[PDB]
Design an enzyme around this catalytic site. Structure first.
Site, PDB file in Angstrom:
ATOM      1  N   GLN E  11       0.816  -1.210   0.000  1.00  0.00           N
ATOM      2  CA  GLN E  11       0.000   0.000   0.000  1.00  0.00           C
ATOM      3  C   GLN E  11       0.851   1.260   0.000  1.00  0.00           C
ATOM      4  O   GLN E  11       0.458   2.273  -0.590  1.00  0.00           O
ATOM      5  CB  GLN E  11      -0.937  -0.002   1.208  1.00  0.00           C
ATOM      6  CG  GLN E  11      -2.256   0.712   0.976  1.00  0.00           C
ATOM      7  CD  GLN E  11      -2.263   2.113   1.547  1.00  0.00           C
ATOM      8  OE1 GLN E  11      -1.555   2.407   2.511  1.00  0.00           O
ATOM      9  NE2 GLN E  11      -3.069   2.988   0.959  1.00  0.00           N
ATOM     10  N   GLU E  62      -3.403  -7.010  -0.712  1.00  0.00           N
ATOM     11  CA  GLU E  62      -4.678  -6.381  -0.396  1.00  0.00           C
ATOM     12  C   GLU E  62      -5.308  -5.821  -1.666  1.00  0.00           C
ATOM     13  O   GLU E  62      -4.691  -4.982  -2.331  1.00  0.00           O
ATOM     14  CB  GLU E  62      -4.484  -5.271   0.627  1.00  0.00           C
ATOM     15  CG  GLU E  62      -5.778  -4.730   1.210  1.00  0.00           C
ATOM     16  CD  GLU E  62      -5.538  -3.698   2.294  1.00  0.00           C
ATOM     17  OE1 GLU E  62      -4.360  -3.405   2.589  1.00  0.00           O
ATOM     18  OE2 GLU E  62      -6.529  -3.180   2.852  1.00  0.00           O
ATOM     19  N   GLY E 135       3.771  -6.014   6.519  1.00  0.00           N
ATOM     20  CA  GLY E 135       4.116  -7.358   6.092  1.00  0.00           C
ATOM     21  C   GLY E 135       4.143  -7.529   4.589  1.00  0.00           C
ATOM     22  O   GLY E 135       4.904  -8.350   4.070  1.00  0.00           O
ATOM     23  N   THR E 136       3.312  -6.774   3.869  1.00  0.00           N
ATOM     24  CA  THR E 136       3.326  -6.849   2.412  1.00  0.00           C
ATOM     25  C   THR E 136       4.597  -6.228   1.846  1.00  0.00           C
ATOM     26  O   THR E 136       5.257  -6.817   0.986  1.00  0.00           O
ATOM     27  CB  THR E 136       2.089  -6.160   1.836  1.00  0.00           C
ATOM     28  OG1 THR E 136       0.909  -6.751   2.391  1.00  0.00           O
ATOM     29  CG2 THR E 136       2.057  -6.316   0.325  1.00  0.00           C
ATOM     30  N   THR E 170       3.242   3.870  13.000  1.00  0.00           N
ATOM     31  CA  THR E 170       1.866   3.543  12.657  1.00  0.00           C
ATOM     32  C   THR E 170       1.497   2.096  12.948  1.00  0.00           C
ATOM     33  O   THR E 170       0.341   1.716  12.740  1.00  0.00           O
ATOM     34  CB  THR E 170       1.605   3.846  11.179  1.00  0.00           C
ATOM     35  OG1 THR E 170       2.412   2.990  10.363  1.00  0.00           O
ATOM     36  CG2 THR E 170       1.939   5.296  10.869  1.00  0.00           C
ATOM     37  N   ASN E 197       9.092   8.925   7.402  1.00  0.00           N
ATOM     38  CA  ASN E 197       7.890   9.743   7.260  1.00  0.00           C
ATOM     39  C   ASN E 197       7.961  11.024   8.082  1.00  0.00           C
ATOM     40  O   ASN E 197       7.538  12.087   7.612  1.00  0.00           O
ATOM     41  CB  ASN E 197       6.654   8.937   7.655  1.00  0.00           C
ATOM     42  CG  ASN E 197       6.210   7.984   6.569  1.00  0.00           C
ATOM     43  OD1 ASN E 197       6.255   8.312   5.384  1.00  0.00           O
ATOM     44  ND2 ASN E 197       5.770   6.798   6.966  1.00  0.00           N
ATOM     45  N   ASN E 219       3.935  11.776  -0.784  1.00  0.00           N
ATOM     46  CA  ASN E 219       4.433  11.067  -1.954  1.00  0.00           C
ATOM     47  C   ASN E 219       4.624  11.977  -3.159  1.00  0.00           C
ATOM     48  O   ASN E 219       5.315  11.587  -4.105  1.00  0.00           O
ATOM     49  CB  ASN E 219       3.476   9.931  -2.311  1.00  0.00           C
ATOM     50  CG  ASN E 219       3.144   9.061  -1.122  1.00  0.00           C
ATOM     51  OD1 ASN E 219       3.823   9.106  -0.096  1.00  0.00           O
ATOM     52  ND2 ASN E 219       2.088   8.269  -1.245  1.00  0.00           N
ATOM     53  N   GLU E 245      25.963   4.566 -12.698  1.00  0.00           N
ATOM     54  CA  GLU E 245      26.874   5.579 -12.180  1.00  0.00           C
ATOM     55  C   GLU E 245      26.758   5.704 -10.666  1.00  0.00           C
ATOM     56  O   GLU E 245      27.745   6.007  -9.986  1.00  0.00           O
ATOM     57  CB  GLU E 245      26.588   6.923 -12.847  1.00  0.00           C
ATOM     58  CG  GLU E 245      27.167   7.072 -14.243  1.00  0.00           C
ATOM     59  CD  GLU E 245      28.643   7.378 -14.231  1.00  0.00           C
ATOM     60  OE1 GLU E 245      29.115   7.972 -13.239  1.00  0.00           O
ATOM     61  OE2 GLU E 245      29.326   7.036 -15.219  1.00  0.00           O
TER      62      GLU E 245
HETATM   63  N1  LIG Z   1       5.350   7.730   2.268  1.00  0.00           N
HETATM   64  C1  LIG Z   1       4.231   7.028   2.422  1.00  0.00           C
HETATM   65  N2  LIG Z   1       4.186   5.998   3.337  1.00  0.00           N
HETATM   66  C2  LIG Z   1       3.051   5.280   3.501  1.00  0.00           C
HETATM   67  C3  LIG Z   1       1.926   5.574   2.750  1.00  0.00           C
HETATM   68  N3  LIG Z   1       0.950   4.716   3.110  1.00  0.00           N
HETATM   69  C4  LIG Z   1       1.430   3.889   4.065  1.00  0.00           C
HETATM   70  N4  LIG Z   1       2.729   4.228   4.320  1.00  0.00           N
HETATM   71  C5  LIG Z   1       3.622   3.575   5.290  1.00  0.00           C
HETATM   72  O1  LIG Z   1       3.766   2.210   4.953  1.00  0.00           O
HETATM   73  C6  LIG Z   1       3.671   1.398   6.103  1.00  0.00           C
HETATM   74  C7  LIG Z   1       3.089   0.035   5.743  1.00  0.00           C
HETATM   75  O2  LIG Z   1       3.471  -0.261   4.420  1.00  0.00           O
HETATM   76  P1  LIG Z   1       2.887  -1.511   3.590  1.00  0.00           P
HETATM   77  O3  LIG Z   1       3.756  -2.736   3.722  1.00  0.00           O
HETATM   78  O4  LIG Z   1       2.799  -1.085   2.146  1.00  0.00           O
HETATM   79  O5  LIG Z   1       1.413  -1.785   4.170  1.00  0.00           O
HETATM   80  P2  LIG Z   1       0.443  -2.845   3.446  1.00  0.00           P
HETATM   81  O6  LIG Z   1       0.772  -3.029   1.988  1.00  0.00           O
HETATM   82  O7  LIG Z   1      -0.990  -2.408   3.614  1.00  0.00           O
HETATM   83  O8  LIG Z   1       0.702  -4.220   4.233  1.00  0.00           O
HETATM   84  P3  LIG Z   1      -0.490  -4.934   5.040  1.00  0.00           P
HETATM   85  O9  LIG Z   1      -1.125  -3.967   6.010  1.00  0.00           O
HETATM   86  O10 LIG Z   1       0.047  -6.132   5.785  1.00  0.00           O
HETATM   87  O11 LIG Z   1      -1.518  -5.387   4.032  1.00  0.00           O
HETATM   88  C8  LIG Z   1       2.825   2.179   7.090  1.00  0.00           C
HETATM   89  O12 LIG Z   1       3.308   2.000   8.399  1.00  0.00           O
HETATM   90  C9  LIG Z   1       2.997   3.622   6.673  1.00  0.00           C
HETATM   91  O13 LIG Z   1       3.867   4.275   7.566  1.00  0.00           O
HETATM   92  C10 LIG Z   1       1.963   6.607   1.827  1.00  0.00           C
HETATM   93  O14 LIG Z   1       0.968   6.875   1.158  1.00  0.00           O
HETATM   94  N5  LIG Z   1       3.119   7.336   1.666  1.00  0.00           N
HETATM   95 MG   LIG Z   2      -2.651  -3.595   3.930  1.00  0.00          MG
END
Ligand SMILES: Nc1nc2c(ncn2[C@@H]2O[C@H](COP(=O)(O)OP(=O)(O)OP(=O)(O)O)[C@@H](O)[C@H]2O)c(=O)[nH]1
Ligand SMILES: [Mg+2]
Ligand SMILES: Nc1nc2c(ncn2[C@@H]2O[C@H](COP(=O)(O)OP(=O)(O)OP(=O)(O)O)[C@@H](O)[C@H]2O)c(=O)[nH]1
Ligand SMILES: Nc1nc2c(ncn2[C@@H]2O[C@H](COP(=O)(O)OP(=O)(O)O)[C@@H](O)[C@H]2O)c(=O)[nH]1
Ligand SMILES: Nc1nc2c(ncn2[C@@H]2O[C@H](COP(=O)(O)OP(=O)(O)O)[C@@H](O)[C@H]2O)c(=O)[nH]1
Ligand SMILES: [Mg+2]
EC number: 3.6.5.-
Lengths: 430, 45, 427, 427, 430
Positions: E11, E62, E135-136, E170, E197, E219, E245
């Protein structure tokens, strides 16, 4: 001229042919009544003033599938007495369709064949459409191919037969019917093309992304396989491939003539704009195992010979470039005694798309038909399932009553045993 | 009385044949590559 | 007043010859209608080598189209410059050989060759002097290979003192267009070595390399390969059609390029081949064409000339040029790489000059090379035949048309003998 | 007829030669299309040294453009005067060096250097007589440093009797465009000492000071920097492209300036550099040209001439000039400061006169200096190398292509040997 | 030809990618449908006639974030099979993303990079986007880099990765996923860029002056960092730098490849008029800790190597002067064995402002990527909190239930333990 007579046996032969003749009219501009508003000579006959009649017979003992054509939208295209019908069907029995109820109908069939043979100047082949799972397509299909060989010696015949799937079986006596059907497919037909239902089912759910396909969607794209194969006699290109050309390049041994089939670009409507259609990637998609029209893994065996029916705007350098990249990959295996393994044929007309069909308009097309040693497992699963039901003598008393006796199951079994040792011995390295 | 002849494919720029290439006319046209065989003119930075 | 009879066999021969007859007609300035519209008297000086006079000034070519599939003869008549050929020369069958060498030679070819032999006898007896016969075919086919080599056998036993230039497209080791390439080719070579006086070797992958590397063509189509082959055949007979300072006809190149009668397979590349973006940068001089003449990439045979020594080489320069500049360049290449030439025949490469260049060309040359480097190409076909013959695969079509097992063994016999003699002189 | 074959290597090498062929063609009068538009017969008298005559009056340079990134060939082609080069001379690869000397010399060099020598031997064998090769590159990068020194070592084996004039952009003391500048330089100088016959050391920090102190340029771009080095490269070969009173070609300066084979690195300066404001005030005379010639800031190398003694220096005077101020001013610079000159050479400085000035300028001169003060430039890079090499920083990348640690020690050993030799004659 | 494949896991990966592919269309004039009204080869492949498809994949377990791309304004731009979905999410479990519910998607994934690999001529690198907090991003990210290493060897997979902040987090289980994913990240990723972040939250508050920033506003400037460093491959400049490079110039040791990031003129609309943005001023503002993408003080460490990517009207002298001013300054401290601490990259095209965005149109911008010794303070932070939860063995039964055993946590701890001695050893004088 280039003349081919397409016989259609059994319900699966009619339904495939009804979709096959749907595509032929749109490619050559034939209106369904039969009036065009010299490519038509391969499948249609000139008739008087502006009328064209197909060079086909729709023979089936079941009247209801033939009568759909008589009352359908193609009531005036077909000759009224080409559509041979019968009183009652074979009831999925090889014994009835070959001995009892098919004897009086096959004599009328050869009379239709002779009149269609005299109208054509030089006949080049027979395209038989049937299924080995049913009684009519197997019993009457073997009967028709017996009389055609003695009447027309040394003349090519191409067999497009639908075989039972390992997972999906719409009837119970399909292993019995297929073993009896394949007894005639060796010594009579010079080219046999394997088909399978569940493999084309798997293509539609993935490539065509349709969730519940019907028999009509299966029949429309198998028509594109036939039309791509016969396109050289109708439309000329850089490298023409005759019907008689197929036997020399794809039949190395007289009892080895079963071939897999594959149509490489199968893309739906909205998918095509995003997809880059190139000669290299379509050839790569041709050899992909899920693009096979028969439920088989080509990785298990080794390829003996191949023919590539290219269509559309394909430069001969790109197919030369694509074939070279195909040979380099280790994922496919060619047999050791055949270094020259590829037949290439380029046609200059892209395949037309029927209105409302799943296939989208593509500028290029590759039809992939190969002789492989992986086809041996397709006959093995039918061989093993046949011996299970024959062990306790199930569904034999139907075959015993109508002509056949208990012996003919044995010779049909041991001829498949000779076929099974043929694939294993030839594919083995020397 | 014959056969249907579809149009033979032409790639780009209307190159009908090797007439210009052999007989030394219409020079200065585009080529397939100038450096490595993968690249082509008018394509790049 | 020297005439050669042109015969085209099979789909490969009919397609190449149709593009060949377009070029020499364009070179001689005759329209596709058939009249004359050139601006020079030198073009009309020698047209009898390729054309017969007809009523009203029509110039009918000395072409005999012979094949099996009627679609092939329908293709040549449909295209441009297809109305020049006479329909009495349009001899054809109906069945189609289907790339079966046994079918095109023994069974089906008997019913057609008797018709073809009457046509070629009609064209031969019409003209006063026969210089030779120019045939075009392939070796991997069955229509132009089985029936084409049958024509070579019957026309040599009836005309034994006349030349025989065969432009044959051999199978490519790199890519296979058919499955029965080594079966047809080894049987075709088995007939060509004792009958064909001068055999020319072409192949598709060498044409594809020239169109990509030197010519830099984006989409080299099916007809582009024939145009360079057409440029070869117009360059061989430049002495017959046009006057030259030093004359070199077919018999001139026959005695020069052939040391021993079995070694007659040649290989030819055309010299001034440049990309369209590099025409204005190159300067065309005699050393410039000579350097391009001896490059391996400019050759229309995939045999690598660096591997084998040149037995005898011939060059046919076309245009107004200094004669020793042509000559000293042959001496220049004889000294720079003398190991690449053969020793016991000193001064291998020798040339000729014609003062009439092709249209739009200030200077051109056609190079004919009899080299032992061609033996690696034939053993590639030979090793493919031996691999397939041990399992007798794709063989029952051949023996169904009356071919016994002995003919394949004899075909492999002299094929290994031919590559033995080429290897023997390389030592 | 003393030909020079030019090769450009890398991103910096392609850009410096892009402005070089723009300047030397403007001196000779060739427009960006390719035709000749000069107003003097003497301009076209010697064009064989840098251009090849083509059909239709077109002139093509003896330039080979080489790199590994196709971005720079897009830069030279889209830029002005970019259509003049031969399309066949655009030999390069697609992988990109990535500022790695080992990748530029070992891994992708094997496939690249085979094709480039075919282009170079085509250019050399075309002309009747060779004078030498003029290559241009940098020592801080990897696309022109490792690849160029592979080319220079390979081309000197093929042509040992011809000189090798190389132009090198060495790393800066104050700044650094790349992190691995000491690694790239010390390996490249280890290859330049035994292959290149003489080297002319260039660097941006001396060009940047010239562009701000004397030229007073507000926005010095790399196009501004490229013209300063390119103005030298025309002035070095001025006696070749033009007749002169006292001719001094590329071998004349080689024997005069180089006492020992290891000592062949020069510090270079172009003399009549004026700002736009000070054009009218400065009177172009030889004595004021000499003081700008011997100014430390006017040197286009960062080594300060005041620190070390000059071994041998040369001047290439251009224009309508008389030869006492050519000689007395070079005599006066000896007696004014004799401590700055090597004692065991009488009259270290040197001069020669060509009577053809550059376009629009009355008097000009190009200064070449071989002084021992350039040792601190090699001392600093050797000092920067040993700091990184002890900690083995940025070396796991270099050893990835196949460079062992022994070669880095041998490269540093030659740097300490070369910096001691300059200090040997300084005492 | 030059081209890079962008891979976005999770995500966090998709939401940056939504902002990324928003930006890439602006430099090349691509409308959301995909029709340009030839520098796009790095990100877009010319398909058919006048349609460009991005060289990307959007894979996530997801489905709730990949369908937003499908139902959003960029429906027609992306190929539908290019976007990869899944039945259920990882629920911030590294074991689920790596072992149980991760293997069935990665097989479909690797067939999709392969088809983008054959379509493209000469690949420069892979741009992978993930976050170790989930985890993803951790589990599927660790799997995907491993499979690209064994399939595409020695190709520079340049990574951007989001890490947990000390003050603001988070998820509770972030330290477990961060340590486990880093162990795979050392041995696989050639070049990785550190993102955090809360530092961007300080950047939005201080420079851009936004009281409540959102993830979309984060982002948008992250995509500017991605686009600026890859702008050298897209558009010509005075001193171009490729993907190859970066790895040979900013990675001093094979395990020390954790480079910081910083951006220059992060300046709002009304702030741009009054700001005198000069090359000397924007270089000094680049090295300030306020402009750092990661909440770590660079004054505690020594800059081993730093790379500056300039865009716009940058004369090469002024960037040459700005190198001297930073190194002369005592506050910015370098390591003693690297005198050549800087690399300059100048591109001629200014950054493209997103319409409706918070950033302003600016002539000049600098992307500051630096390899420092202060990254170990971030990894000492993650090492401490990992030992706190692991001592009481908290949130471990989720992981060991889904495939993993106990041993993987200790080996990942020791492997990350050796990193802070390695960062201390490389920072200590000798
Ligand atoms: N810079 C940035 N960070 C983000 C954003 N959305 C989520 N994050 C960070 O990404 C972390 C989790 O990343 P992911 O592994 O992609 O979360 P996920 O894909 O939903 O994984 P699951 O919840 O297990 O399904 C969170 O703790 C946030 O701090 C975003 O839009 N921009
Ligand atoms: Mg998720
Ligand atoms: N490809 C394709 N196969 C079909 C279609 N309809 C039926 N089949 C196949 O045909 C089999 C049914 O047996 P058939 O051979 O059609 O039966 P029959 O020939 O009519 O013999 P009787 O039913 O006794 O009259 C099924 O198992 C299917 O696999 C069709 O529309 N397309
Ligand atoms: N260069 C060239 N090669 C051709 C042409 N036509 C056919 N071939 C080659 O001939 C082979 C096929 O031979 P075929 O046409 O079947 O021979 P046939 O049996 O006499 O018709 C292929 O390998 C082609 O590469 C042509 O027009 N030009
Ligand atoms: N004078 C000049 N120097 C340049 C130019 N481009 C790059 N350089 C110098 O080249 C050095 C970097 O070397 P690089 O180009 O990476 O060498 P490469 O690896 O061969 O491409 C820098 O110190 C620049 O000062 C240019 O256009 N003109
Ligand atoms: Mg039925």
């Amino acid at each position: 001229m280039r003349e081919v007579i397409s016989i259609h046996i059994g319900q699966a032969g009619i339904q495939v042919g009804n979709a096959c003749w749907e595509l032929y009219c749109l490619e050559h501009g034939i209106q369904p009544d039969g009036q065009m508003p010299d490519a038509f000579n391969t499948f249609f006959s000139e008739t008087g003033a502006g009328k064209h009649v197909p060079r086909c017979i729709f023979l089936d003992l079941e009247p209801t599938v033939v009568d759909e054509v008589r009352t359908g939208t193609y009531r005036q295209l077909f000759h009224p007495e080409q559509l041979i019908s019968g009183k009652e069907d074979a009831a999925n029995n090889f014994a009835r369709g070959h001995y009892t109820i098919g004897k009086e109908i096959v004599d009328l069939a050869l009379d239709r064949i002779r009149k269609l043979a005299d109208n054509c100047t030089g006949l080049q082949g027979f395209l038989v459409f049937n299924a080995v799972g049913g009684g009519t397509g197997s019993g009457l299909g073997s009967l028709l191919l017996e009389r055609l060989s003695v009447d027309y010696g040394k003349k090519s015949k191409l067999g497009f037969t639908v075989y039972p799937s390992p997972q999906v079986s719409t009837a119970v006596v399909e292993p019995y019917n297929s073993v009896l059907s394949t007894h005639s497919l060796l010594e009579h037909t010079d080219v046999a093309v394997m088909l399978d239902n569940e493999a084309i089912y798997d293509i539609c759910r993935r490539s065509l992304d349709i969730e519940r396909p019907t028999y009509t969607n299966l029949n429309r794209l198998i028509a594109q396989v036939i039309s791509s194969l016969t396109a050289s006699l109708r439309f000329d290109g850089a490298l023409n491939v005759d019907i008689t050309e197929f036997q020399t390049n794809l039949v190395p041994y007289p009892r080895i003539h079963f071939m897999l089939s594959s149509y490489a670009p199968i893309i739906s409507a909205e998918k095509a704009y995003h997809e880059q259609l190139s000669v290299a990637e379509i050839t790569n998609a041709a050899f992909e195992p899920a693009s096979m029209m028969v439920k088989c893994d080509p990785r298990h065996g080794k390829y003996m010979a191949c023919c590539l029916m290219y269509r559309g705007d394909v430069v001969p350098k790109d197919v030369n470039a694509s074939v070279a990249t195909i040979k380099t990959k280790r994922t496919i295996q060619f047999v050791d005694w055949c270094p020259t393994g590829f037949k290439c044929g380029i046609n200059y007309q892209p395949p037309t798309v029927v209105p409302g069909g799943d296939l989208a308009k593509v500028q290029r097309a590759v039809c992939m038909i190969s002789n492989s040693t992986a086809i041996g497992e397709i006959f093995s699963r039918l061989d093993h399932k046949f011996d299970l039901m024959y062990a306790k003598r199930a569904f034999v008393h139907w075959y015993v009553g109508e002509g056949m006796e208990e012996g003919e199951f044995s010779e049909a079994r041991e001829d498949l045993a000779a076929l099974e040792k043929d694939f294993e011995e030839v594919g083995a390295e020397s | 009385s014959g056969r249907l002849r579809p149009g033979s494919p032409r790639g780009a720029d209307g190159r009908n044949g090797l007439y210009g290439v052999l007989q030394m006319t219409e020079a200065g046209g585009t080529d397939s590559w100038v450096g490595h065989p993968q690249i082509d003119p008018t394509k790049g930075k | 007043m020297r005439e050669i009879v042109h015969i085209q066999g099979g789909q490969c021969g009919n397609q190449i010859g149709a593009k060949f007859w377009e070029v020499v007609s364009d070179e001689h300035g005759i329209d596709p209608t058939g009249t004359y519209h050139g601006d020079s008297d030198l073009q009309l000086e020698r047209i009898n080598v390729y054309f017969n006079e007809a009523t009203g000034g029509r110039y009918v070519p000395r072409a005999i189209l012979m094949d099996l599939e009627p679609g092939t003869m329908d293709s040549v008549r449909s295209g441009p410059y297809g109305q020049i050929f006479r329909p009495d020369n349009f001899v054809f069958g109906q069945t189609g050989a289907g790339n079966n060498w046994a079918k095109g030679h023994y069974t089906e070819g008997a019913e057609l060759i008797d018709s073809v032999l009457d046509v070629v006898r009609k064209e031969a007896e019409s003209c006063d002097c026969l210089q030779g016969f120019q045939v075009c075919h392939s070796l991997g086919g069955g229509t132009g290979s089985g029936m084409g080599t049958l024509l070579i056998s019957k026309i040599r036993e009836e005309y034994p003192d006349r030349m025989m230039l065969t432009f044959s497209v051999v199978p490519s080791p790199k890519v296979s267009d058919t499955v029965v390439e080594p079966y047809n080719a080894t049987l075709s070579v088995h007939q060509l070595v004792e009958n064909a006086d001068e055999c020319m070797v072409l192949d598709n992958e060498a044409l594809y390399d020239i169109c990509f590397r030197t010519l830099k063509l984006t989409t080299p189509t099916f007809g582009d390969l024939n145009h360079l082959i057409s440029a070869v055949m117009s360059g061989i007979t430049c002495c017959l059609r046009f006057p030259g300072q030093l004359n070199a006809d077919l018999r001139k190149l026959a005695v020069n390029l052939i040391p021993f009668p079995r070694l007659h397979f040649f290989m030819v590349g055309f010299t001034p081949l440049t990309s369209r973006g590099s025409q204005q940068y190159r300067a065309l001089t005699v050393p410039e064409l000579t350097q391009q003449m001896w490059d391996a990439k400019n050759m229309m045979c995939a045999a690598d000339p660096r591997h084998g020594r040149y037995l005898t080489a011939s060059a046919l320069f076309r245009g107004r040029m200094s004669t020793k500049e042509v000559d000293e360049q042959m001496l220049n290449v004889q000294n720079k790489n003398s190991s690449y030439f053969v020793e016991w025949i000193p001064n291998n490469v020798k040339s000729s000059v014609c003062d009439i260049p092709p249209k739009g060309l200030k200077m051109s040359a056609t190079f004919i090379g009899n080299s032992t480097a061609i033996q690696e190409m034939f053993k590639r076909v030979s090793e493919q035949f031996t691999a397939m013959f041990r399992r007798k695969a794709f063989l029952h079509w051949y023996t169904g048309e009356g071919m016994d097992e002995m003919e394949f063994t004899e075909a492999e016999s002299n094929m290994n003998d031919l590559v033995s003699e080429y290897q023997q002189y390389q030592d």
